[PDB]
Amino acid sequence: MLLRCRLPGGVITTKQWQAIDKFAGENTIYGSIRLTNRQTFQFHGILKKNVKPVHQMLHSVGLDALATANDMNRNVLCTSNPYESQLHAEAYEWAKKISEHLLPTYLPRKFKTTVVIPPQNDIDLHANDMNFVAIAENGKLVGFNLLVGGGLSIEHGNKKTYARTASEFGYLPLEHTLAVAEAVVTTQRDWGNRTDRKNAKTKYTLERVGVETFKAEVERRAGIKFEPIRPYEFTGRGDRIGWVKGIDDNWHLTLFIENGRILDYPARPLKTGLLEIAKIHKGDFRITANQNLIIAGVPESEKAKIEKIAKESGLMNAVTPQRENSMACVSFPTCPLAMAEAERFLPSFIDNIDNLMAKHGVSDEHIVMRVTGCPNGCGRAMLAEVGLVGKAPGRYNLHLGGNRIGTRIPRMYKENITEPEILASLDELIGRWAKEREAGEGFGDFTVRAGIIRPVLDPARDLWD
Numbered sequence: 001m002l003l004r005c006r007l008p009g010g011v012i013t014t015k016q017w018q019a020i021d022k023f024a025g026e027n028t029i030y031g032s033i034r035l036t037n038r039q040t041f042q043f044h045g046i047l048k049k050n051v052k053p054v055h056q057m058l059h060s061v062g063l064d065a066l067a068t069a070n071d072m073n074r075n076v077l078c079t080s081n082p083y084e085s086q087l088h089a090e091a092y093e094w095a096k097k098i099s100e101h102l103l104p105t106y107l108p109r110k111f112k113t114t115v116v117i118p119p120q121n122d123i124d125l126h127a128n129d130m131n132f133v134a135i136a137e138n139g140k141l142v143g144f145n146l147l148v149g150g151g152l153s154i155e156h157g158n159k160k161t162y163a164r165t166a167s168e169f170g171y172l173p174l175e176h177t178l179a180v181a182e183a184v185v186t187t188q189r190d191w192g193n194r195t196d197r198k199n200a201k202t203k204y205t206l207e208r209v210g211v212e213t214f215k216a217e218v219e220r221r222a223g224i225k226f227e228p229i230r231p232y233e234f235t236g237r238g239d240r241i242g243w244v245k246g247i248d249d250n251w252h253l254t255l256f257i258e259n260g261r262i263l264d265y266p267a268r269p270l271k272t273g274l275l276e277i278a279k280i281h282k283g284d285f286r287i288t289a290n291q292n293l294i295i296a297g298v299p300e301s302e303k304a305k306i307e308k309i310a311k312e313s314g315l316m317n318a319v320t321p322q323r324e325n326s327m328a329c330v331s332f333p334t335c336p337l338a339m340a341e342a343e344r345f346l347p348s349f350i351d352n353i354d355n356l357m358a359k360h361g362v363s364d365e366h367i368v369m370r371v372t373g374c375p376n377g378c379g380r381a382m383l384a385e386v387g388l389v390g391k392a393p394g395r396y397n398l399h400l401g402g403n404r405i406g407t408r409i410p411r412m413y414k415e416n417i418t419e420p421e422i423l424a425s426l427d428e429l430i431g432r433w434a435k436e437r438e439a440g441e442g443f444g445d446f447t448v449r450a451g452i453i454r455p456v457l458d459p460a461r462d463l464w465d
């Protein structure tokens with residue numbers, strides 16, 4: 001009653017879309033397509049009668065789901081809508097090559113990989129084991145900076161677990177990408193703590209052996225020496241909602257989809273709308289790491305026809321910058337591990353946050369705000385400026401002090417509190433931010449600067465109070 005597709009970089013054809021739309025509507029309990037924050041999609045509630053039909057459906061359009069249980073990798077991410085549009089094709093080709101290279105070495109724990117195009121960190125590289133940060137010259141990839149060892153999962157009350165950001169190893173020319181990817185994976189395979197499953201992730205391996213030790217073994221196995229890191233900076237993690245110009249005469253329409261949940265709602269036929277777009281659209285779709293959808297490669301002559309369907313179906317309903325930059329995991333009703341609501345909580349929670357932002361005169365601003373239903377961390381709250389981590393029904397740990405670009409873990413601020421208490425705290429804090437912030441200063445950076453919360457500087461040692 002849960003299927004998830006392999007879909008490197010989130011790129012899905014309109015023929016593939018029509019097939020998964022038909023299956024979702026006819027052969028699942030919930031009737032939805034759920035976009036995931038690893039750039040793929042899920043069905044919910046597949047009856048026993050429809051388990052063979054769904055793998056045959058995927059195969060009929062060239063898709064595979066083939067998970068996982070004995071076979072550990074997850075979907076390889078790729079920046080969906082780079083500002084330098086010409087870089088996407090090559091970066092996506094490399095995400096596909098890496099994905100195919102790592103198809104079945106049993107790993108100690110699942111392993112997550114990304115291809116990132118600065119200045120966008122939409123794929124949230126610090127949540128991932130292995131990250132290839134693209135470096136380009138003259139519109140062509142020349143190589144990657146490698147960052148290793150991110151991961152967000154924690155267990156409540158267990159100070160031996162922690163979220164960790166990823167560590168820079170150095171730069172590699174493009175030709176060494178697959179050798180380096182294999183070397184990182186096999187080093188983790190060999191050095192990971194297999195016995196203790198809560199200690200098996202690469203983030204723990206790196207802390208046990210040291211970054212230089214792991215890096216040296218990767219160099220030896222890959223047959224390379226890393227070069228110094230080549231400069232890169234991120235400016236944000238959000239999607240580019242609306243129309244942006246791509247390559248040639250093409251345009252990309254990114255649609256905000258709340259929680260990535262695609263279903264026909266009253267007066268908002270989101271699912272039928274996307275089907276009608278799939279039937280006329282000349283290009284592909286791209287599922288983003290923010291659970292949104294890009295209608296990619298629209299010729300200028302077709303913009304008006306695509307926008308008409310999107311507007312009439314509810315897919316272009318205006319929301320605040322705050323809502324565009326908020327995210328939650330699935331949680332209830334389908335997740336067996338859920339402690340508190342996330343997806344079903346987020347719309348009314350952000351309604352309340354929207355009122356606080358307006359009350360303090362910052363309705364045009366945003367705070368990267370995420371809700372995760374339990375500390376496994378799928379909603380990526382442990383990279384948010386404001387993160388909520390489910391503890392029990394209606395109760396969350398409130399974390400503060402991440403940043404807009406996702407390079408710092410937020411420390412826990414208040415433990416095991418309800419929504420009214422969270423909103424009361426955030427009302428006070430957003431008020432202070434609005435009045436005391438420096439020009440362009442984000443909410444998370446402010447809570448650190450103003451001494452509201454201490455920063456997390458070295459998570460393996462200082463995440464836990």
Ligand code: SRM
Pocket residue numbers: 002004035036037038039040041042074075109112124127128150151152153154201291328329330331334335336337376377378379380
């Ligand atoms: C759908 C998604 C959340 C979303 O709203 O988008 C999701 C949903 C679930 N995740 Fe995940 N995870 C999703 C991204 C993540 C991420 C974020 C990311 O990868 O960018 C994390 C934190 C990053 C990390 O791994 O450190 C994440 C860490 C987990 C973990 C904890 C892993 C660990 O190291 O301890 C579990 C539990 C487990 O593996 O035992 C888990 C388990 C689950 C399961 C399958 C629960 C289960 O084991 O039975 C969830 C199914 C819920 C449902 O009913 O659909 N999921 N999960 C994401 C699907 C991504 C995908 O296509 O593969």
Ligand code: SF4
Pocket residue numbers: 329330331332335336337338339342372373374375376377378379
């Ligand atoms: S964070 Fe917990 S509740 Fe949310 S989807 Fe992941 S496992 Fe389920």
Ligand SMILES: [K+]
Pocket residue numbers: 256257258259260290291292
């Ligand atoms: K979304």
